[PDB]
Amino acid sequence: TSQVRQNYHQDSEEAINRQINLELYASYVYLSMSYYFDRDDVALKNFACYFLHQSHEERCHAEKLMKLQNQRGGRIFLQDIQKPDEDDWESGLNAMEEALELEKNVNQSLLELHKLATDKNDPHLADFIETHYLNEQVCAIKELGDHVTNLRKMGAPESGLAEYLFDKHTLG
Amino acid sequence: STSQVRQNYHQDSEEAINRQINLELYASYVYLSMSYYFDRDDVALKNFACYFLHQSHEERCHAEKLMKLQNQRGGRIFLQDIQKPDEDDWESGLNAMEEALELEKNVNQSLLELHKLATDKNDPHLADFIETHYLNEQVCAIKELGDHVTNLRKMGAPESGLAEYLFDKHTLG
Amino acid sequence: TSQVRQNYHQDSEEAINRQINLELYASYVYLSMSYYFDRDDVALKNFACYFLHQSHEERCHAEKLMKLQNQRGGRIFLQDIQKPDEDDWESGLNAMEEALELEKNVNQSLLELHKLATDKNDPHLADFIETHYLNEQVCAIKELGDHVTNLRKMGAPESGLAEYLFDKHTLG
Amino acid sequence: TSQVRQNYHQDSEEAINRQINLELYASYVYLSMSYYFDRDDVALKNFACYFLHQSHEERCHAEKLMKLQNQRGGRIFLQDIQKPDEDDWESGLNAMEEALELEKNVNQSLLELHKLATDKNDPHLADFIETHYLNEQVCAIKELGDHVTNLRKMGAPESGLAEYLFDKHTLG
Amino acid sequence: TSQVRQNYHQDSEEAINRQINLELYASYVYLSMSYYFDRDDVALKNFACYFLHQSHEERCHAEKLMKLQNQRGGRIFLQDIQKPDEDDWESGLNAMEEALELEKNVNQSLLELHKLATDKNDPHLADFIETHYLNEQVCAIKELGDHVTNLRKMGAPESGLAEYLFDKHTLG
Amino acid sequence: TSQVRQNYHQDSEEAINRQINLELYASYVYLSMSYYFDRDDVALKNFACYFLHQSHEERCHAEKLMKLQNQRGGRIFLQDIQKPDEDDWESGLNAMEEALELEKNVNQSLLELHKLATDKNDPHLADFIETHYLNEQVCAIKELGDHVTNLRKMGAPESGLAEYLFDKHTLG
Ligand SMILES: [Fe+3]
Ligand SMILES: [Fe+3]
Ligand SMILES: [Fe+3]
Ligand SMILES: [Fe+3]
Ligand SMILES: [Fe+3]
Ligand SMILES: [Fe+3]
Ligand SMILES: [Mg+2]
Ligand SMILES: [Mg+2]
Ligand SMILES: [Mg+2]
Ligand SMILES: [Mg+2]
Ligand SMILES: [Mg+2]
Ligand SMILES: [Mg+2]
Ligand SMILES: [Mg+2]
Ligand SMILES: [Mg+2]
Ligand SMILES: [Mg+2]
């Protein structure tokens, strides 16, 4: 047992290792979307920049959980980072819809982690999840919803003009 | 199916670039694992942790630049799973530096094979890209890791915990 | 023989004279495109500025090759600069497609020059072409591909609105 | 007919296309002369810089006529740019004498262009040629005459000392 | 075998040790030339300064090859540095002609070293020689041929006035 | 006989040429030591930096003597620079002991040169050696003795820890 470990359930330690993997997985999905928009036959530079920024933020989300595992005296066990479900993300609107679904899936995992921390009477871990993850998730999900709504109302994805102008005026 | 930009870019080179993107992401993940080993309360060498986190971010840059190259030449990125590292516990500062040295020589071997493929397919843009952005970076990385291994061994690591502590402070700090 | 000449094949010297001509030709094509977009019945000022910049860069490409010829002790022999294939470039989209074909033709010529340098064991000339020309050509072709993709997706050339907005938001 | 065209004779439009060709020809002659002086067996760097500057100014002279053609509603028709009459310009003095001759030939063309504008009652074109071209030519011809006079008095082209000192003290 | 050594042929290691000696020999030749021009019976201070600068640059060329040898895991074996072929360099023109011959001999040795790197499939060593040495050699050879041409055209070495004015106006 | 020469014995001239050689020799020993410490299997960067700075200072000692030879109207005759006695300097302590022996040998040569200047009644040369060389040698020998003492007392060369900490805290 770590000399630092106090009130830190084995189930919590294991759940943090699963969440670390899911944040790295989210980083990889965003990295894939980024370079889709960099293709010469897609060529939406601000979509590319937006998703690359998201990719770097997900890596920070993972690193902060690795720091938490060590702060609580848990042991990090990394797993393979699975490749994203798509190679071709089809359109700006479809990438934003896939990102929205990804962020709600990550949020569901964080809410299960919070329930576990509550069930094991771990108020430090509950507070860490509320403070650093749950509001960030609600803000990310609201921003992706707003982007989806605008792209739909503009006529995406059938209007290439719509995706071009969204790229310039919202993401640029 | 052929990109409007594609010129003198062999399908074998496009595939070799997808394999190299995977290996650079792999190397990033190895260095991330090493970084958080040294952050453990029972290891607690912060400058080793910082050194390997910096290496992790640089390997991510190496991957992103190859993804940019793929699209520049009109090839198509196909990502694969990023395999977890061979170890969870890296044992010591010396053992982590020896594992990083082996990793960097394995990455360099892959880059030399990619350069040979660019040469055999008469792709001088790709040959130049690999020489300019990867091959001297690898030779510099391998020489630094060799220098670090030598100093740790000469100081008495890994048995001398005093050695790794003082190396952490005076070389990596 | 020049007092500076060393390891510089006659074939290489001749191929550098043909490349000087091709860079001046490319400069002239872009000058013609530039002033097409300046016509009162075309009036896309950022297309004009974009192609005039490209024309000035091709002149620089020519001058640097003339400098190389003298550095290696070859002798510059200039040839007529042929006028471009069109007087009327039709549309923003058509000029960009014509520029993309021109840059791929210039790249083919540079790759033949690199092969000749390699075949004559001229590592100085190989390196010169790689360092100053081959990566510039890859960047130029990618940028022109991106521009063609955006114009097509926006509905060019039939949409005069598409060419107007592209002129403003991408080239402006 | 262009919606902008007013008081612009077809002959004047055709004369401006001929003058664009002649300005681009002059630019090419000066570029040739520049890289002659850069040869390892000539090696007068301030002659080289002087002539390259003159090359770049002639390109500006051509672009300004292209702008004028579009301003008046005429249509630009480019022609091949003929290579210069020499590959080897022989000496600093001979280059300066050939430049003087070239500038007097361009001046003669500009004076015929002015007579045409006067004969067609085109005072805008007459003014444009007087304002932008005729005093520049008189200044250029006077400077080239001054340079020829000094190189001759100094002992050029037989004195290699003369050309070296002129390069340093007048052109440097 | 060094723990760093990878794809580095013994022949390449030995060729690098030979090139280190040749760069140190070139440094020594230029040091000799420098102090010939500092003699009270020669007294061309800018020739002295020019050659001493060339001497310090050759020392940098040697040091960078010593670094390369250790970077690749090869072992530096230093050899005697042979004194230059002359004690008395006769004139400014003669020193410049000897320097041009020296820089072409060093270039031939670097081209041989590049061929060896190519034959041993050592692209890192090939790129190192092209990046740091081959273009520097072409620039040095072009500069020395320019200097020889000017001194000859001015009347050197028989004109002590020529060498005096070249020392002031080109090297000062 | 040089027009500047006064009270400058042939024996003094010859001794100055021998001292120039010895200073160049010392520069080469320190260069060799420098790149020994840069080897991947030695890797003491501050030892490397220390010895390279010494190498550059010995070069300055040789150049100032060449200047003196010319100031006095003597004639420089350069000799081969012999390679150092070792390729492998074994340890930081062994390198410092070898440097101490070298500096005492150079000092002995300078003391014999001073005796020559005294025996030939050359007060200018006597003062030159005292002012520029003898106090510098005393300072270099004391510094090297202090470094040898500290390395021995720390437990070098058997303690790799000693040489590491000396590199950081004394040379760094
Ligand atoms: Fe996240
Ligand atoms: Fe990498
Ligand atoms: Fe070009
Ligand atoms: Fe003009
Ligand atoms: Fe050199
Ligand atoms: Fe000394
Ligand atoms: Mg985010
Ligand atoms: Mg797996
Ligand atoms: Mg690295
Ligand atoms: Mg361009
Ligand atoms: Mg013709
Ligand atoms: Mg002018
Ligand atoms: Mg190559
Ligand atoms: Mg010293
Ligand atoms: Mg000898």
Side-chain angles (χ1 to χ4, degrees), chain A, chain B residues 2-173, chain C, chain D, chain E, chain F:
Chain A
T1 177
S2 179
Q3 77 185 323
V4 304
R5 199 191 183 112
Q6 184 168 31
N7 196 38
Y8 193 56
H9 201 281
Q10 180 182 321
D11 289 4
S12 302
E13 178 178 359
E14 288 171 2
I16 290 290
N17 281 332
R18 290 196 302 271
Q19 187 70 36
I20 290 164
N21 190 260
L22 179 59
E23 301 290 345
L24 293 167
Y25 171 77
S27 186
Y28 205 21
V29 171
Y30 282 132
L31 173 62
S32 179
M33 289 179 177
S34 185
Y35 279 92
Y36 172 78
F37 291 105
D38 183 63
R39 288 165 58 153
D40 74 84
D41 58 4
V42 176
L44 291 169
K45 287 184 313 75
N46 294 311
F47 276 88
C49 289
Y50 177 82
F51 289 127
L52 191 56
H53 171 90
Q54 296 303 328
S55 180
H56 293 349
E57 293 191 327
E58 294 306 330
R59 176 175 184 80
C60 295
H61 298 174
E63 293 176 354
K64 181 178 285 152
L65 287 165
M66 292 172 76
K67 177 183 171 55
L68 180 282
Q69 183 76 282
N70 279 343
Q71 285 175 302
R72 291 303 297 276
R75 291 293 168 250
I76 299 159
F77 286 98
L78 297 175
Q79 298 298 340
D80 304 337
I81 312 166
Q82 179 169 290
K83 71 183 196 166
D85 287 343
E86 302 290 351
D87 302 308
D88 181 314
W89 295 98
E90 287 197 357
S91 67
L93 169 62
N94 185 66
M96 292 285 184
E97 287 178 339
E98 292 277 323
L100 174 60
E101 167 184 80
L102 171 67
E103 292 290 356
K104 292 183 87 169
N105 289 329
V106 177
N107 197 35
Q108 180 60 31
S109 173
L110 286 161
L111 293 170
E112 291 164 2
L113 192 18
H114 191 286
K115 174 184 152 50
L116 175 62
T118 302
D119 288 348
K120 302 301 194 185
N121 305 298
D122 190 336
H124 175 265
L125 177 58
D127 172 66
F128 175 89
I129 297 302
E130 288 162 22
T131 298
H132 295 292
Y133 290 83
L134 296 185
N135 196 41
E136 163 63 29
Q137 279 316 110
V138 156
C139 290
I141 290 165
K142 175 66 159 65
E143 171 178 287
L144 290 165
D146 292 353
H147 292 343
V148 168
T149 289
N150 276 286
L151 280 167
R152 281 178 186 156
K153 281 195 145 150
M154 296 172 73
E158 292 86 356
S159 181
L161 191 52
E163 289 204 344
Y164 175 92
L165 287 174
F166 182 87
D167 175 279
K168 178 71 180 194
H169 298 318
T170 295
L171 299 183
Chain B
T2 309
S3 169
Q4 74 186 327
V5 306
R6 201 193 186 107
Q7 184 169 30
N8 194 39
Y9 197 51
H10 201 282
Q11 185 195 343
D12 295 358
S13 306
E14 183 182 356
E15 286 167 7
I17 291 290
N18 284 331
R19 291 192 303 270
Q20 189 74 32
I21 286 161
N22 194 256
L23 184 55
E24 301 288 344
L25 293 168
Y26 175 77
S28 183
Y29 205 22
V30 169
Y31 281 131
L32 172 63
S33 172
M34 286 178 178
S35 176
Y36 280 91
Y37 172 80
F38 289 101
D39 180 66
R40 289 168 51 158
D41 80 86
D42 58 1
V43 181
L45 292 172
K46 286 148 357 81
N47 297 308
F48 278 83
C50 297
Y51 176 79
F52 290 127
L53 192 59
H54 173 81
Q55 292 310 320
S56 179
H57 292 183
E58 173 176 12
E59 292 304 335
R60 169 63 171 244
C61 296
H62 293 176
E64 289 176 3
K65 179 185 293 176
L66 288 159
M67 291 173 72
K68 175 186 178 59
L69 185 277
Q70 187 75 286
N71 282 343
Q72 285 173 311
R73 291 303 297 280
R76 289 296 168 253
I77 296 159
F78 286 92
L79 296 169
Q80 300 300 343
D81 296 356
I82 306 161
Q83 301 298 283
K84 71 188 173 84
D86 292 333
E87 304 295 338
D88 306 303
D89 177 319
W90 293 100
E91 288 197 346
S92 68
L94 175 60
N95 184 66
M97 289 289 184
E98 294 176 337
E99 292 277 329
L101 177 62
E102 176 163 75
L103 169 69
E104 289 296 355
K105 300 182 82 179
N106 285 334
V107 174
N108 192 38
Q109 175 68 21
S110 167
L111 290 163
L112 293 173
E113 287 161 7
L114 186 37
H115 193 284
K116 172 174 152 41
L117 178 67
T119 303
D120 287 348
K121 301 302 192 193
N122 304 305
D123 189 340
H125 174 265
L126 177 59
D128 176 67
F129 175 84
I130 298 301
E131 296 163 15
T132 299
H133 299 291
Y134 291 80
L135 295 186
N136 193 46
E137 173 63 29
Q138 281 316 99
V139 161
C140 292
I142 292 163
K143 178 62 165 59
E144 176 179 287
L145 288 168
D147 296 351
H148 288 348
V149 165
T150 288
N151 276 285
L152 279 164
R153 281 181 185 158
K154 289 197 85 108
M155 292 171 78
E159 294 89 353
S160 171
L162 189 57
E164 299 207 336
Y165 172 91
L166 289 173
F167 183 90
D168 175 282
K169 300 297 190 186
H170 299 318
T171 296
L172 304 177
Chain C
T1 161
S2 167
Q3 70 189 329
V4 302
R5 203 188 182 112
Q6 187 174 28
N7 192 41
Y8 195 49
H9 204 276
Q10 190 185 333
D11 292 0
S12 299
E13 173 184 4
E14 282 170 8
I16 288 290
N17 281 340
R18 297 195 294 272
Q19 190 72 33
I20 290 165
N21 190 264
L22 183 56
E23 300 294 342
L24 291 164
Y25 170 80
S27 184
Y28 204 24
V29 172
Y30 284 131
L31 176 67
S32 173
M33 292 182 174
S34 179
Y35 278 91
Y36 173 78
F37 289 106
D38 185 61
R39 287 168 52 155
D40 75 87
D41 58 358
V42 181
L44 296 164
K45 300 146 91 97
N46 293 309
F47 280 84
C49 292
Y50 178 80
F51 290 126
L52 192 57
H53 179 263
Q54 298 306 326
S55 177
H56 290 169
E57 302 283 47
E58 299 299 336
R59 167 67 171 236
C60 291
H61 293 173
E63 286 175 7
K64 183 180 304 178
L65 284 165
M66 290 174 75
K67 179 195 176 57
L68 179 283
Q69 187 74 287
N70 283 344
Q71 280 173 303
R72 296 294 304 277
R75 288 301 165 244
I76 299 167
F77 287 96
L78 296 173
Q79 302 295 343
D80 305 339
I81 309 158
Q82 184 169 297
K83 68 183 175 119
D85 286 341
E86 305 291 349
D87 307 307
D88 176 322
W89 294 100
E90 174 216 298
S91 70
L93 171 61
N94 187 67
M96 290 288 179
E97 295 183 334
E98 292 283 336
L100 174 62
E101 175 183 317
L102 169 70
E103 294 291 354
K104 291 188 84 178
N105 286 336
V106 173
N107 197 34
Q108 178 63 28
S109 175
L110 288 161
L111 291 167
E112 292 163 10
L113 190 42
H114 189 285
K115 175 187 146 50
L116 176 62
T118 303
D119 289 347
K120 303 301 195 194
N121 299 297
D122 191 338
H124 177 270
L125 176 63
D127 169 73
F128 171 87
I129 293 157
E130 285 158 27
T131 303
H132 300 289
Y133 291 85
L134 296 185
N135 196 38
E136 295 309 312
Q137 279 317 111
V138 165
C139 291
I141 290 164
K142 178 58 162 66
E143 171 179 294
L144 288 166
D146 295 353
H147 292 343
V148 163
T149 293
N150 276 283
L151 283 159
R152 282 172 183 156
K153 279 194 138 134
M154 293 168 82
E158 295 84 6
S159 181
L161 194 53
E163 295 210 336
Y164 174 88
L165 287 169
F166 182 86
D167 174 283
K168 181 62 173 199
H169 294 316
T170 290
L171 305 178
Chain D
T1 300
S2 173
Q3 73 186 330
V4 303
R5 204 185 181 117
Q6 185 169 27
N7 199 36
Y8 196 49
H9 200 284
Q10 186 194 342
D11 293 357
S12 299
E13 177 181 0
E14 291 177 357
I16 288 287
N17 284 330
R18 296 195 300 271
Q19 189 69 33
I20 291 160
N21 193 261
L22 182 59
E23 300 293 344
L24 290 167
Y25 172 76
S27 183
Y28 203 25
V29 173
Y30 284 134
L31 178 63
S32 179
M33 287 184 174
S34 181
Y35 281 91
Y36 175 76
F37 290 101
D38 180 69
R39 288 166 54 157
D40 74 273
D41 57 1
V42 180
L44 296 166
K45 294 174 166 41
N46 294 311
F47 279 85
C49 293
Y50 178 77
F51 289 122
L52 192 62
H53 169 80
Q54 301 302 329
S55 182
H56 289 349
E57 293 295 333
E58 296 302 330
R59 168 66 167 247
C60 299
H61 296 176
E63 288 175 6
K64 183 177 294 177
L65 285 160
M66 289 172 76
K67 178 184 180 57
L68 181 281
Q69 186 71 289
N70 283 339
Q71 279 173 308
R72 293 301 299 278
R75 295 290 169 246
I76 297 163
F77 287 93
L78 299 170
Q79 300 300 343
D80 300 352
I81 309 158
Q82 296 302 287
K83 75 183 170 91
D85 284 341
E86 306 293 350
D87 302 309
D88 178 323
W89 291 105
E90 193 176 87
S91 72
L93 169 61
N94 187 65
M96 291 290 181
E97 292 178 337
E98 293 278 319
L100 177 57
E101 188 51 18
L102 168 70
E103 292 292 351
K104 293 188 89 176
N105 294 330
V106 169
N107 199 30
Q108 182 61 36
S109 165
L110 286 162
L111 292 173
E112 292 168 358
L113 190 26
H114 194 281
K115 176 180 149 36
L116 176 62
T118 302
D119 286 343
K120 303 308 195 184
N121 302 309
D122 192 336
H124 179 264
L125 179 53
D127 179 64
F128 172 89
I129 296 304
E130 286 158 24
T131 300
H132 296 291
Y133 292 78
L134 299 186
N135 200 36
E136 291 306 318
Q137 286 308 121
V138 160
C139 289
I141 293 164
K142 176 60 163 68
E143 176 174 282
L144 286 168
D146 294 353
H147 291 347
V148 164
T149 287
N150 277 281
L151 283 162
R152 283 181 184 152
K153 291 201 136 150
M154 288 167 82
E158 296 86 355
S159 181
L161 198 48
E163 292 208 346
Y164 173 89
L165 288 174
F166 182 84
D167 172 282
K168 298 289 191 198
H169 298 322
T170 296
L171 305 179
Chain E
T1 172
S2 173
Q3 74 188 324
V4 305
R5 199 190 183 108
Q6 183 172 31
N7 197 36
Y8 195 59
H9 199 285
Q10 189 182 324
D11 295 2
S12 300
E13 179 178 4
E14 291 170 351
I16 288 292
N17 285 335
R18 291 194 300 273
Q19 188 70 35
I20 284 158
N21 189 265
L22 179 57
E23 300 295 339
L24 293 166
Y25 170 78
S27 182
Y28 203 23
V29 170
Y30 285 132
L31 172 63
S32 179
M33 289 180 178
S34 176
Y35 280 92
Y36 171 77
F37 290 100
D38 180 69
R39 289 168 53 155
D40 75 89
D41 59 2
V42 180
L44 293 170
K45 281 168 176 147
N46 295 314
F47 277 87
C49 286
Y50 176 80
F51 288 125
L52 191 62
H53 176 84
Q54 299 304 328
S55 181
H56 294 166
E57 292 319 282
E58 297 301 337
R59 170 69 178 242
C60 295
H61 295 174
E63 286 176 5
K64 180 182 283 172
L65 289 157
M66 291 173 75
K67 177 172 150 64
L68 182 279
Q69 184 73 288
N70 281 341
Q71 286 174 296
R72 292 300 301 274
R75 295 290 168 246
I76 295 161
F77 288 96
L78 294 174
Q79 300 297 342
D80 297 355
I81 310 160
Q82 294 309 276
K83 67 185 182 156
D85 288 339
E86 302 296 348
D87 304 308
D88 177 321
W89 293 104
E90 285 181 29
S91 73
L93 173 58
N94 189 67
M96 291 287 179
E97 289 180 339
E98 293 275 322
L100 173 61
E101 174 185 330
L102 169 68
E103 294 289 0
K104 294 182 89 184
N105 293 334
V106 173
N107 198 35
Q108 180 58 36
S109 165
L110 291 159
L111 290 175
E112 289 168 2
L113 192 29
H114 191 281
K115 172 184 145 41
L116 176 61
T118 305
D119 293 344
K120 299 309 195 184
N121 297 300
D122 190 339
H124 174 267
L125 176 54
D127 168 76
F128 173 86
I129 297 305
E130 289 160 20
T131 296
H132 297 289
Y133 288 82
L134 295 190
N135 195 43
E136 161 69 25
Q137 283 314 105
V138 159
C139 292
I141 293 159
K142 179 56 161 66
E143 180 175 275
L144 284 168
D146 291 351
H147 290 346
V148 166
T149 286
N150 274 286
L151 279 162
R152 284 176 177 151
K153 287 210 171 177
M154 293 167 77
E158 295 89 0
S159 169
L161 190 56
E163 292 206 343
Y164 172 91
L165 289 179
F166 181 88
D167 171 283
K168 299 303 192 178
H169 297 321
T170 293
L171 300 184
Chain F
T1 304
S2 162
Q3 70 185 328
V4 304
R5 201 195 184 107
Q6 186 167 31
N7 194 38
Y8 196 52
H9 202 279
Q10 184 188 109
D11 293 0
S12 296
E13 177 180 0
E14 287 167 12
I16 290 286
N17 284 330
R18 285 193 305 271
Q19 190 68 38
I20 290 162
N21 194 258
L22 183 55
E23 301 293 344
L24 290 173
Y25 175 74
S27 189
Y28 202 22
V29 174
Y30 283 131
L31 175 65
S32 175
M33 292 179 173
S34 183
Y35 280 87
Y36 175 75
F37 289 105
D38 178 66
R39 290 170 49 155
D40 74 269
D41 54 6
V42 181
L44 295 167
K45 291 173 174 142
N46 296 308
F47 277 85
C49 291
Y50 176 81
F51 287 124
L52 189 63
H53 170 266
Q54 298 303 330
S55 177
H56 288 176
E57 178 168 357
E58 297 301 336
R59 171 57 168 248
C60 293
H61 296 175
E63 288 173 4
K64 178 180 301 176
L65 284 165
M66 290 173 74
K67 177 188 175 68
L68 182 277
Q69 182 76 289
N70 276 349
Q71 286 173 300
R72 292 301 297 280
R75 291 291 164 252
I76 296 163
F77 288 96
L78 295 174
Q79 299 297 341
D80 301 347
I81 310 163
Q82 173 172 112
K83 68 192 184 88
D85 284 342
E86 304 292 345
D87 305 311
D88 178 320
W89 291 101
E90 299 191 2
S91 67
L93 173 57
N94 188 67
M96 290 289 181
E97 290 182 328
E98 290 276 303
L100 174 60
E101 184 179 6
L102 175 66
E103 290 290 0
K104 293 189 83 186
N105 289 327
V106 174
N107 194 37
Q108 177 63 26
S109 169
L110 289 165
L111 292 173
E112 290 161 359
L113 183 54
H114 191 285
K115 172 181 152 34
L116 183 60
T118 302
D119 285 355
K120 301 309 195 186
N121 300 305
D122 187 340
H124 177 262
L125 180 58
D127 171 75
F128 173 86
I129 293 157
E130 286 161 30
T131 298
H132 295 294
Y133 291 85
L134 298 185
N135 195 42
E136 169 65 51
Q137 285 309 113
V138 162
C139 287
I141 289 165
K142 175 64 162 58
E143 177 178 287
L144 285 167
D146 295 349
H147 291 344
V148 166
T149 293
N150 275 286
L151 283 161
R152 283 174 183 155
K153 284 181 96 67
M154 298 168 70
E158 294 82 0
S159 175
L161 193 54
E163 295 210 336
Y164 175 91
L165 290 174
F166 183 89
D167 175 281
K168 307 288 144 326
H169 298 318
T170 295
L171 298 181

